Amino acid sequence: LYVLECDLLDDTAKQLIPVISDYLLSNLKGIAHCVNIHSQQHVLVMCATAFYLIENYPLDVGPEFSASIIQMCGVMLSGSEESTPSIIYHCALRGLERLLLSEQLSRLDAESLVKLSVDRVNVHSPHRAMAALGLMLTCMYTGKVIVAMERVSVLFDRIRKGFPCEARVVARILPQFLDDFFPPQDIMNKVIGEFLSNQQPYPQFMATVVYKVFQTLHSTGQSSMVRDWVMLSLSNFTQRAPVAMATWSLSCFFVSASTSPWVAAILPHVISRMGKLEQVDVNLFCLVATDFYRHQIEEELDRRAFQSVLEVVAAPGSPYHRLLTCLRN
Amino acid sequence: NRIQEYLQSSGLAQRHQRLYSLLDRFRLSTMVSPDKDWYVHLVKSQCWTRSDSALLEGAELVNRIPAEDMNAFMMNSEFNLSLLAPCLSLGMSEISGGQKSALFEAAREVTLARVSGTVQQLPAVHHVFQPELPAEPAAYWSKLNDLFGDAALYQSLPTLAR
Amino acid sequence: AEAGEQFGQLGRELRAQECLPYAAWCQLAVARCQQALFHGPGEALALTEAARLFLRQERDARQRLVCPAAYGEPLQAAASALGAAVRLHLELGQPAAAAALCLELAAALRDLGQPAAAAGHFQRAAQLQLPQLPLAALQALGEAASCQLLARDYTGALAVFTRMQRLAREHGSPAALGAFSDVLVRCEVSRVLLLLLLQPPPAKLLPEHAQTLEKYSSSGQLPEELFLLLQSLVMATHEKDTEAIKSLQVEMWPLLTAEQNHLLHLVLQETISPSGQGV
């Protein structure tokens, strides 16, 4: 590693690089699936020098070597939690991530490993999945709806079948991720659709996602586009599991779509009290509803659709019913 | 009536609603614009308490009040001192982004203000803390026993050390 | 033959003057001589001695005198020799001896500050022992779970604890046989704490974890006070009453091991201050 680092190795020393490359391949194939059996520090070293050779000496090693080694450590990543120690998994993944992030990799080899990124997102261990989330994130930020539809889908799944720490991270990076790879109308059914559902363990994490996606629309010349979508999905919000959950999701939906400075800034409060149906909760729900209605509704005749939808499930003591009483006058 | 009053006077009625409903059912058988001032009052309901369930959210709520009002908000008593660590943690997170944190600057000037405040209550002369027999001086050790033995004071120390 | 004895007394003399790297080298030489003699037991003993000498070298360089210039150099040689010895043992049978060598390597790695590799080697030893010595395999898996908790691999630790509980129930029975009862108690408490910490969603919630959580909402083999405190802890974490977890954490401190005390502290910490938010 020292010798080939920056020394302008003379073209006579082109008889050394193949020897290292031959040793690299001849000693990685016999361990590429049983890494745990063999020495950790050793295999770490071949990966380190192999990654440097591709990044810095692409012509000196044949394109087969660059290809043969990406698949070589691809099977290392595709191993189980026992067949590949977490040390080796993260080293190869970050090493591959650097190799793609540096344009020295060939086009055939670059697209050879972007496929490997999506496979390793779905693993049990949060850190192996979160690390593989990074590799896929760079693999798709380097290339730039035909395929990005799949990638955003496997992001919403991790929020659904992931631990709260794992899911909170994905929920935090979604608002920028959606703002980058899709136009707002292309991905807008999913964000509301994944927000409220029965297969959503953390709708409180998705509450911020709809908020940031709405706010990044309200302040970027789409203050009326969000008005169409809240009206469109209000009927969907009307039918949602328990009544308290339905109002809570509805209350935080108006918060996410409210342009008032002091209403758009109380989202953590409603997220904090989740599933509560106290007097303050309905009072907050009515207040945010009318402030979306009275202040920033579309027009005078569009209120009929708003008045029609919420009247459907009006009950004697329902929070919806109290909203009519305030909204009527 | 006393049983009903006691349940409502405490959190047990909220914790056990079914029992309270049954007791009350037995009892009857016997025969505004959302302005800045509204926001401040709302966060005042959540950030002036002793609840530690939601501090990450409480930090964000206090993060949005005007910078000029931040100092009087935290300096004022009945403010959850457990929020100071989230307040500094969140305020630093946007300093690391390059911005100027009104929250972090207003929070660190509160932490040091309280740290200095609780030092004034310490004895003027400090003796080596002897775990075995802290009783050779009389006034000094008695000055710590009623200091470290105060729930309002002892609880305030780790919640300020954080 | 005679060369092996010569290398043996060379290694003995070198260890007498405590130049133990060369003693381990001589042990490797006598192991090679045993290879030439096709004597499997003697070669395994020689490789074990060489590995032990290298491990003592690394311990001195890292534990006795903490040398920052040490980069785990004799540890690599120790691991290579131990792997060769394990391979020889397995090729001549005796999986118990190979599992013992793997346990030795895992203990060495755990003391040297590499919990992940230690847990991996502990799991390998348990797998080697499981078909014949289920209790030894359970102990090795317990060491692996402790190492994984050291490496902050909480989900891996939960998986290992669940595997140990399954193995103890299916091997130590219905009531446990005492030697498996303590293993089951440790499994139960550690799994409950890890499930309160991780809080798996319904997708990740395996039937075993769901059943265990159901049990805490009667006491199989846990002491009644500990079982009641664990039930209170589960209810509090499902209720988000931080004062309750604080009081319990104070109360259950003497009844839990240091590992379980750490797990309960992690549960409390993730309750007040959730991780993953970035702040």
What's the reported resolution, in angstroms, to a tenth? 2.7
Question: What is the distance between the alpha carbons of residues A278 and A212, in angstroms, rounded to a whole number?
Answer: 27
Task: Give which of A116, A82, A81 is closest to A96, Cα–Cα.
Answer: A116
Query: Across the interface, do C278 and A202 touch by the CB < 8 Å criterion?
Result: no
Residue A155 CA to its chain's centroid (Å): 4
C-alpha span between A163 and A154 (Å, rounded): 15
With CA atoms as reference, the chain B residue closest to C274 would be: B56
- Cβ separation C201–A160 shorter than 8 A: yes
Comparing CB atoms, the residue among A268, A271, A291 nearest residue B34 is A291
Q: Does A269 contact B at CB distance below 8 Å?
A: yes
* Alpha-carbon torsion angle A108, A113, A114, A118, nearest 10: 150
Start-to-end C-alpha separation, chain C: 67
Within 8 A of C272 by CB-CB distance, chain B residues are 52, 55, 82
Give chains near B: 3+ CB pairs under 8 A.
Answer: A, C
Contact A250, A237 (CB under 8 A): yes
Residue among A17, A15, A16, A38 nearest A27 (CA): A38
Distances from the Cα of A173 to the Cα of A93, A155, A178, A206, angstroms: 20, 10, 9, 11
Q: Do C204 and A161 touch (CB under 8 A)?
A: yes
CB atoms within 10 A of CB A64: 10
Please say whether the beta carbons of A240 and A196 come within 8 A. yes
User: How distant, in Å, are the alpha carbons of A258, B146, C50, C101, C278 from that of C80?
Assistant: 65, 62, 10, 12, 41
- Which helix H or strand E contains C37, and what residues bound it? helix C20-37
SS3 A213: helix
Three-state secondary structure readout of chain B: CHHHHHHHHCCHHHHCHHHHHHHHHHHHHHCCCCCHHHHHHHHHHHHCCCCCCCCHHHHHHHHCCCHHHHHHHHHCCCCCHHHHHHHHHHHHHHHCCCCCCHHHHHHHHHHHHHHHHHHCCCCCCCCCCCCCCCCCCCHHHHHHHHHHCCHHHHCHHHHHHC
Residue C9: how many other CB atoms lie within 10 Å: 11
Tell me how many degrees the CA angle A11-A14-A16 measures, rounded to the nearest 5.
Answer: 140
> Considering all CA atoms of chain C, what is the largest pairwise distance in Å, rounded to the nearest integer?
74
Cross-chain Cβ contact A287/B32 below 8 Å = yes
Contact criterion met (CB below 8 Å) for A196 and A231: no
Chain A residues closer than 8 Å to B42 by CB = 266, 269
Measured between beta carbons, which residues in chain A are less than 8 angstroms from residue C209? Answer: none
Question: What sign does the CA torsion over C123, C125, C129, C134 have?
Answer: negative
Query: Within 10 Å of residue C160's Cβ, how many Cβ atoms?
Result: 27
Those residues of chain B whose CB sits closer than 8 Å to some CB in chain C are 51-53, 55-56, 59, 82, 85-86, 89-90, 93
Give the phi and the psi of residue C103 in degrees, each rounded to 5. Answer: -65, -40
Report whether A158 contacts C264 (CB < 8 A). no
Name the packing angle between helices A40-56 and A86-101 (round to 10°).
0
> ∠ CA(B129), CA(B135), CA(B140), 5° rounding?
70
Tell me the C-alpha distance between A144 and A199, whole Å.
Answer: 32
CB contact under 8 Å between B58 and A268, yes or no, is yes
CA atoms of A9 and C136, how far apart (whole Å): 55
Spatial CB neighbours of C203, under 8 Å, sequence gap ≥ 6 = A160, A161, A201
Say which residues have a Cβ less than 8 Å from residue C29's Cβ, sequence separation at least 6: C7, C10
Give the HSE-up count for residue C259: Cα atoms under 13 Å, Cβ half-sphere. Answer: 19
Residues contacting residue C164 through CB under 8 Å, at least 6 positions apart: C138, C141, C142, C145, C183, C187
Chain C residue at shortest CA distance from A170 = C276
Closest CA to A120 of A141, A137, A108: A137
Which residues contact residue B140 at a Cβ distance below 8 angstroms, ignoring those fewer than 6 apart?
B123, B125, B127
Q: What is the DSSP string of C135-152?
A: HHHHHHHHHHHHHHHHTT
CA distance B126 to B124: 7
Asked if residues A282 and A251 have their Cβ atoms less than 8 Å apart, the reply is no
End-to-end CA distance of chain A: 78
Tokens found for residue C275: 């991780």
Alpha-carbon distance B52 to nearest alpha carbon in chain C (angstroms): 6
Please judge whether C242 and B51 are an interchain contact, meaning their C-beta atoms are less than 8 angstroms apart. yes
The two tokens of residue B140 are: 């000094």
Q: Do A269 and B36 touch (CB under 8 A)?
A: no
For residue C265, the tally of other CB atoms under 10 A from its CB is 14
What would the two tokens of residue C144 be?
């692996």
**Residue A105, Cβ neighbours under 10 Å: how many?**
22
Count Cβ–Cβ pairs < 8 Å, chain B vs chain C. 21
User: Which residue of chain A comes nearest to C155, CA vs CA?
Assistant: A125
CA-based nearest distance A256→chain B, Å: 15
The single-letter code of the amino acid at A202 is Y
DSSP conformational letter for A1: -
DSSP string, C151-178: TT-HHHHHHHHHHHHHHHHHH------S
Name every chain A residue with its beta carbon within 8 A of the beta carbon of C80. 39
Backbone angles phi, psi at B126, to 5 degrees: -100, 130
What is residue C82's DSSP assignment? H
Kind and range of the H or E run holding A114? helix A107-119
How close does chain A come to B37, measured CA to CA in Å? Answer: 9
CA pseudo-torsion sign B75, B77, B82, B87:
negative
Closest CA in chain C for residue A169: C276
